[PDB]
Structures are given as structure tokens and as C-alpha cells.
């Protein structure tokens, strides 16, 4: 359909870019981070993106947990 768990790789960017996390797409897409990993993201994962950005560590963190409503409304 259009849900995040159905995103492959490049479809995860659409989200990231929306929260200014486009900076993470460069690595998110590299490790094939899909909605599967998007939804359950934690600091360890965000750190494993090698970016470890302070803003993002809090921002993506908020966005990823509310993805359940945000995936739809974009």
C-alpha cells in the first residue's frame, strides 16, 4: 500500500527528508534501512548510521515513534 513496513530502501528517504533528516538518507539507504528498522530505531541504530548528530538524536527519535500517524500524512 503505502505503509512504512512496505518501504524498501529509497522509500525510507521520503520520511527523513520531511524532518530535515535528509542528511541521514545517505547512510539509511546504504544499510538498507527500511520501515522495519525505522519504527524500532534507537540511539544504537542512529549511532550505527555514523552520523550521531545531536539534533537528530532527539528529532528523528520523536518522529520515528509517531511514524504510525506520520507515514500516512507525510
UniProtKB/Swiss-Prot annotation:
Q: What does this protein do?
A: Binds to actin filaments (F-actin) and shows cross-linking activity. Binds along the sides of the F-actin. May be involved in neurite formation. Inhibits protein phosphatase 1-alpha activity. May play an important role in linking the actin cytoskeleton to the plasma membrane at the synaptic junction.
Q: What is known of its domains?
A: Interacts with p70-S6K via its PDZ domain.
Q: Covered range within the whole protein?
A: 986 to 1056 of 1095
Tissues in which the UniProt entry reports expression: Brain, and widely expressed in neural tissue. Highly concentrated in synapses of developed neurons. In developing neurons, concentrated in the lamellipodia of the growth cone.
- The entry's protein name is Neurabin-1
| Annotated compartments | Cytoplasm, Cytoskeleton; Synapse, Synaptosome
Q: How does it assemble?
A: Possibly exists as a homodimer, homotrimer or a homotetramer. Interacts with F-actin, protein phosphatase 1 (PP1), neurabin-2, TGN38 and p70-S6K.
- Could you tell me which residue ranges the SAM domain spans? 7-70
Organism in which the protein naturally occurs: Rattus norvegicus
Q: Which domain of life is it from?
A: Eukaryota
Amino acid at each position: 500500500g503505502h505503509m512504512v513496513h512496505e518501504w524498501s530502501v529509497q522509500q525510507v528517504s521520503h520520511w527523513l527528508v520531511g524532518l530535515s533528516l535528509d542528511q541521514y538518507v545517505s547512510e539509511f539507504s546504504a544499510q538498507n534501512i527500511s520501515g522495519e528498522q525505522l519504527l524500532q530505531l534507537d540511539g544504537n541504530k542512529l549511532k550505527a548510521l555514523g552520523m550521531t548528530s545531536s539534533q537528530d538524536r532527539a528529532l528523528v527519535k520523536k518522529k520515528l515513534k509517531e511514524m504510525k500517524m506520520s507515514l500516512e500524512k507525510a
